[PDB]
């Protein structure tokens, strides 16, 4: 009963479609939002709910690593500590990443272009490989 | 790096209020959903807190689906417990904590919500041989 | 490595009923799980029944089901597995073993002791 | 509950010579954790059992390399490189999908006279 993405105009689904190859890491996400972004980050301004979202996304994924860490530590048998690590990194990271570039995104170049991107790139999918032009649209400036 | 910030607290502000005082989670859940769902449900953009509410509650659902993902597998009935016991009461504190305050400052104003956590500290700091009986609530 | 020592094995009078001591050190207890593996001569492995770390769940097979108890005392750290109604077809060496590859196989076996029942 | 069988009975090595030998399982082992629960133990005259193989395609530790398994499914093999005079015993194969444990029927291995 949640749609996060209907603040702005998205759908969950608009997302959904892209791949996971397409997201960049996670390390380069973090990197950005604290280079580009740390001098207003911290200080209050209001509207832009970009950045509420992504200071709330950085305190989750740092729970998070927080937890891997605590697992880490204890559980003395190996055999689950793999496990446990590849589901919290790789399957539950998903979203993270899922979420981090979209606000990243829309902060650099607005909602009036982005949201253009993903229609565009949902009917290039879309279709079959045989007759998809040759590489997928670039999201440009 | 700063939960709150730009509410005009910080986190050391919250340090007085004792762990063990705070509500239990199913409360805030229903207190949020019940009272609030229309303001969950409307296409205007504003009061931050909304979002971060949002927030809140997706980040308990990741954190449910989990706890059910390991409950259904990890057969060693012991490592299961340890990780659901630890979920359960360890994982919750900052989440809880998240929803006392943001549920608290719609429904009540901000400056209600800033005098009633700065008084409270008075309570604990007293001493119970003269410390009033009672302590303070947020009331309205 | 850990070390478990067992005791209590040797010939029992028919018809009775004998309780064999497996003791172990070295590790959490209350951490893992413990199991018993029998082996008649002539024949291989055979698993018996096992116990969590709680104690309140069980299993067993049925050759020996509702014949066999086992139980765990936490406070000194020691296995027990009790004998009752035995027959000429459990004159066997037994072992109490530990498994820790995500409760799967067994990792350290003990040295095992002989049970011989005869007249 | 669950059928073990093993195969072959028996198995005289020339010893610096690879061997294989397959056991199989009526049930599927792939749990949804994309783990196969099945086990390699190696037992010794007058000695208790040792470990072999762990979570089916996972070395137990201390375990010279001489030893190596794969596999999938119903069906499991297990390979040495080389043999050497130590390597004598009876090998088992067991099972941990589903409540009671079972084990195998045994492979014993012996010098070709």
């Known amino acids: 009963d949640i749609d996060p993405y209907k603040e702005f105009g998205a759908s969950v689904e608009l997302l959904s479609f892209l791949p996971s190859d397409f997201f960049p890491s996670i390390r380069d996400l973090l990197d950005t939002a604290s280079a580009l972004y740390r001098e207003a980050l911290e200080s209050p301004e209001h509207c832009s709910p970009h950045h509420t979202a992504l200071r709330q996304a950085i305190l989750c994924w740092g729970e998070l690593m927080n937890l891997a860490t605590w697992v880490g530590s204890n559980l003395e048998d190996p055999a689950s500590r793999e496990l446990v690590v590849s589901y919290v990194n790789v399957n539950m990271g998903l979203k993270i990443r899922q979420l981090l570039w979209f606000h990243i995104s829309c902060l650099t170049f607005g909602r009036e272009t982005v949201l253009e991107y993903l229609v565009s790139f949902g009917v290039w999918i879309r279709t079959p490989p045989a007759y998809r032009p040759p590489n997928a649209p670039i999201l440009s400036t | 790096i700063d939960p709150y910030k730009e509410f005009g607290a910080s986190v050391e502000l919250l340090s007085f209020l004792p762990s063990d005082f705070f509500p239990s989670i199913r409360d805030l859940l229903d207190t949020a959903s019940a009272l609030y769902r229309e303001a969950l449900e409307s296409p205007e953009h504003c009061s931050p807190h909304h979002t971060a509410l949002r927030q809140a509650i997706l980040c308990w659902g990741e954190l449910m689906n989990l706890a059910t993902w390991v409950g259904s597998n990890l057969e060693d009935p012991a490592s299961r417990e340890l990780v659901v016991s630890y979920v359960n009461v360890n994982m919750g504190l900052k989440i809880r904590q998240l929803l006392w305050f943001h549920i608290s400052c719609l429904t009540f104003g901000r400056e209600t919500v800033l005098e009633y956590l700065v008084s409270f500290g008075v309570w604990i700091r007293t001493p119970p041989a003269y410390r009033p009986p009672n302590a303070p609530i947020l009331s309205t | 490595q850990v070390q478990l020592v067992e005791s209590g094995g040797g010939v029992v009078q028919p018809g009775r009923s004998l309780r064999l001591s497996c003791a172990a050190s070295?590790?959490?207890?209350?951490?893992?799980?413990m199991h018993w593996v029998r082996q008649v001569p002539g024949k291989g492995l055979e698993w018996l029944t096992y116990?969590?770390?709680?104690?309140?769940?069980?299993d067993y097979v049925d050759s020996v089901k509702g014949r066999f108890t086992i139980s765990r005392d936490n406070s000194i750290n020691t296995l027990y597995l009790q004998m009752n109604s035995l027959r000429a077809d459990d004159t066997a060496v037994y072992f109490c073993?530990?498994?820790?590859?995500?409760?799967?196989?067994?990792?350290?076996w003990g040295q095992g002791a002989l049970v011989i029942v005869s007249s | 509950d669950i059928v073990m069988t093993q195969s072959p009975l028996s198995l005289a090595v020339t010893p610096g010579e690879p061997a294989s030998i397959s056991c199989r399982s009526s049930?599927?082992?792939?749990?949804?954790?994309?783990?196969?629960?099945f086990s390699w133990y190696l037992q010794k005259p007058g000695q208790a059992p040792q470990l072999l193989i762990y979570?089916?395609?996972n070395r137990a530790p201390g375990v010279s390399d001489r030893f190596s398994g794969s596999g999938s499914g119903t069906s499991f093999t297990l390979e040495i490189s080389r043999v050497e005079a130590e390597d004598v015993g009876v090998y088992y194969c067991?099972?941990?999908?589903?409540?009671?444990?079972?084990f195998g029927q045994g492979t014993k291995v012996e010098i070709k006279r």
């Open positions: 979570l089916g395609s």
């Open positions: 067991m099972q941990g999908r589903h409540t009671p444990w079972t």
């Open positions: 116990i969590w770390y709680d104690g309140s769940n069980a």
């Open positions: 070295g590790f959490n207890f209350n951490k893992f799980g």
């Open positions: 073993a530990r498994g820790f590859y995500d409760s799967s196989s067994l990792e350290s």
């Open positions: 049930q599927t082992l792939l749990h949804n954790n994309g783990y196969n629960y």
